[PDB]
Design a protein around this ligand. Structure first.
Ligand SMILES: *[C@@H](O)[C@H](C[C@@H]1CCNC1=O)NC(=O)[C@H](CC(C)C)NC(=O)OC[C@@H]1C[C@@H]1CCC
Ligand SMILES: *[C@@H](O)[C@H](C[C@@H]1CCNC1=O)NC(=O)[C@H](CC(C)C)NC(=O)OC[C@@H]1C[C@@H]1CCC
Lengths: 302, 302
C-alpha cells in the first residue's frame, strides 16, 4: 500500500526567473534578483586563501560596484550600489527584474517545510523540499557552486523567501542564511569545522505522519491510552524529541480521523521503544519529514 | 549523518508554461499545450454516469471542436481539430504556445525516475519525482482533478514528456499514459477495479543506494564475497527482485568506490534476509527509489 505522501515542492518557475550568477573574480555563486536588488552570499568576495577566516568588513570596503559581475543566463546587470547585511550582500542593479513575483522575506522554524531551488552558475538544476531541523540544519543536496540557491514557501501567489544556501557541515547536512542576513542556528560563514547541536525528532511531524497512517486505514498503533501534552513534553526532553505544540492543522487531522492528539503522543512513546517488527506506512522507524499541512493537503485535499 | 540524497525534481518552469485547463462540460482536467496541440486524457469526454464503461469511440464522434473549452490561467484557446490516440486526446488549437520548450515524447522504463508537475484546474500546484515501478504504477500524490498532470525527464534543454496522469488504484498507487496514448502496464482508463501486478524491488536502484552508502563512508555490508549477475538474477526471480542489468552509470560508481557490482549483489542477498539491527544511510530496509544517475549527480557531481 502507498500512503499517497511524496516530498512535494512548490512549482519553481517564479523563482527560476529570479536567479542570476554573481562573480567577484574568485568564486562564482548564485544570486536572487528581486526588483532592483540582487542578494547573494557575502563569501563571493572572499579569495580562497581566506575562506577560513575572512575579514568581511575589509573585503566589503575593498570592493567597488563594478567588482561585482552579475549575469542572467536562463542579461548583464550593472551594479550601482552594494551593501552587506549580516552574511548576505545586497547589490543594487540598474534594471528591475521584470519577472519579480509578489514576495516577502520570512524565517522558517524547526519542523516546517520549504522548497529549495538548487542552482549552479546561475542555472537552476533541481528542486527539492526539506524541513528545517531542530538544530537549524537541513538535510539537503548541495555541491560546490550551489551557494546562493534559495529556499521558499508560498502563500497564494506570494513567495516567502526564507533560506539562502551557505555551507555544508561535516555530517553532510547544510545551513544558510535568512534574508535578514542571519545564519540559521549558531553557524558562521567561515570555512572551519563548527560545533553542531544535537538534532531531535520533530514531534508534531511524527504526529502528522501517524495521522497519515490512520487516514490510510493503518491504525494498529492507536489505543484508547492517552498521554497529555504536558506529560509528553516532559518525556520529550529526555528522549531526543522536540516539545509538541499543537496547531489548527493538527486539530483538523484529529477531527477527520476521530483520533485524539493525546492518543498519538502515547503511541509515540511506545513506538520510540520499538515497532516490534510491525511497520507503519512501510517504515520501521518514526517519520518526521512530513508536516501536518503536507498531510492535510496531499491526502485530504485541504 | 546525512547521505546528501534528496528526491530531486527538474525545475518545473518550462512545463508550467505549457499547462492549460480542458473542460467538456463534465469534468475539468488539465492539458499540455505544445505548438498547436493540446494533449489531455480522453475521459474528459465522459459523463460521470459512464466512467465505469465509456464507449470512447462514440463519445469522440459526439464531440465537435467547440465542445472542448481550453483555457490558460497562469488565454482562451479555440479548438480547430480533435483526434483520439489511445487514451489521449490530441486537440488542435488556433494559437501555437509561444513558450513551447524543445521537447520529445518518450516512454519511461521501470526503475527510471521522472519529475511530475501536479496540476488542478490548469494551475500547477506542486512538483515531485517518482520511479516507474516494475508493475507500471507510480507512488505519487494525486487527487480528484489532477488528471492531465504530466511527467517528464530532461536532457539538456530538451524536455522528454513520458507520463500523463489518469488514475489511482485501490492500493493508493497511480498510473497514466505515455504520449503515444498507451497506458503504462495492462491498465485501462475505466473506473473499475483492475488486476494489479506484483511489485518488485528494483535491483539496479538498490545497488545504486549501496554505492551511495559507500560514498558516504558507510561500507559495513561490503565483503569480498561476490555473486555473479547471472546467479543473482536467478535468485531475483524467486525473491521479489527485478533482474539486474548494469549500465555505464553503475560502472562509474564501481570505479569511484573500488567496490565491484558483484560484491553488492552478494550484499543484497544477505541484507534481504535482514539487516540484523544495523542501519544503512539511516534505513533498516533496502531503498530502491534512487537511481544510479541520482547518485552520480547528487553525490559525485556528474
Ligand atoms: C557554496 O559556496 C558552498 C556550498 C557547500 C560546498 C560543498 N557543499 C555545500 O553545501 N559553500 C562553501 O564551500 C562554504 C564556504 C564558507 C566560507 C561559508 N564552506 C563549506 O561548506 O565547507 C564545507 C566543508 C565540509 C567542511 C566544513 C568547513 C570546514
Ligand atoms: C483524474 O480524473 C482522476 C485522478 C485520480 C482521482 C483520485 N486520485 C487520482 O489519481 N482520475 C479518475 O478519477 C479515474 C477516471 C477513470 C475513468 C480513468 N478513476 C480513478 O482513478 O478511480 C480511482 C478509485 C480508486 C478506485 C479505482 C477505480 C474503481
Amino acid at each position: 500500500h502507498h500512503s499517497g505522501l511524496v516530498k512535494m515542492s512548490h512549482p519553481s518557475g517564479d523563482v527560476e526567473a529570479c536567479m542570476v550568477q554573481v562573480t567577484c573574480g574568485s568564486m562564482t555563486l548564485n544570486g536572487l534578483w528581486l526588483d532592483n536588488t540582487v542578494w547573494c552570499p557575502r563569501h563571493v568576495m572572499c579569495p580562497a586563501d581566506q575562506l577560513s577566516d575572512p575579514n568581511y568588513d575589509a573585503l566589503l570596503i575593498s570592493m567597488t560596484n563594478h567588482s561585482f559581475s552579475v549575469q542572467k543566463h536562463i542579461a548583464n546587470l550593472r551594479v550601482v550600489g552594494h551593501a552587506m547585511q549580516g552574511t548576505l550582500l545586497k547589490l543594487t542593479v540598474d534594471v528591475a527584474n521584470p519577472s519579480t513575483p509578489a514576495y516577502t522575506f520570512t524565517t522558517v522554524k524547526p519542523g516546517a517545510a520549504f522548497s529549495v531551488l538548487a542552482c549552479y552558475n546561475g542555472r537552476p538544476t533541481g528542486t527539492f523540499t526539506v524541513v528545517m531541523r531542530p538544530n537549524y540544519t537541513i538535510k539537503g543536496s548541495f555541491l560546490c557552486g550551489s551557494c546562493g540557491s534559495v529556499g521558499y514557501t508560498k502563500e497564494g501567489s506570494v513567495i516567502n523567501f526564507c533560506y539562502m544556501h551557505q555551507m555544508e557541515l561535516a555530517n553532510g547536512t547544510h545551513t544558510g542564511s535568512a534574508f535578514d542576513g542571519t545564519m540559521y542556528g549558531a553557524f558562521m560563514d567561515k570555512q572551519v569545522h563548527q560545533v553542531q547541536l544535537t538534532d531531535k525528532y520533530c514531534s508534531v511531524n511524527v504526529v502528522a505522519w501517524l495521522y497519515a497512517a490512520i487516514l490510510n486505514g493503518c491504525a494498529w498503533f492507536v489505543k484508547p491510552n492517552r498521554t497529555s501534552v504536558v506529560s509528553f513534553n516532559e518525556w520529550a526532553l529526555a528522549n531526543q524529541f522536540t516539545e509538541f505544540v499543537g496547531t489548527q492543522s493538527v486539530d483538523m487531522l484529529a477531527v477527520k480521523t476521530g483520533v485524539a492528539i493525546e492518543q498519538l503522543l502515547y503511541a509515540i512513546q511506545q513506538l520510540y521503544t520499538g515497532f516490534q517488527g510491525k511497520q507503519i506506512l512501510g517504515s520501521t522507524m518514526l517519520e518526521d519529514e512530513f508536516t501536518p499541512e503536507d498531510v492535510n493537503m496531499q491526502i485530504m485535499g485541504v
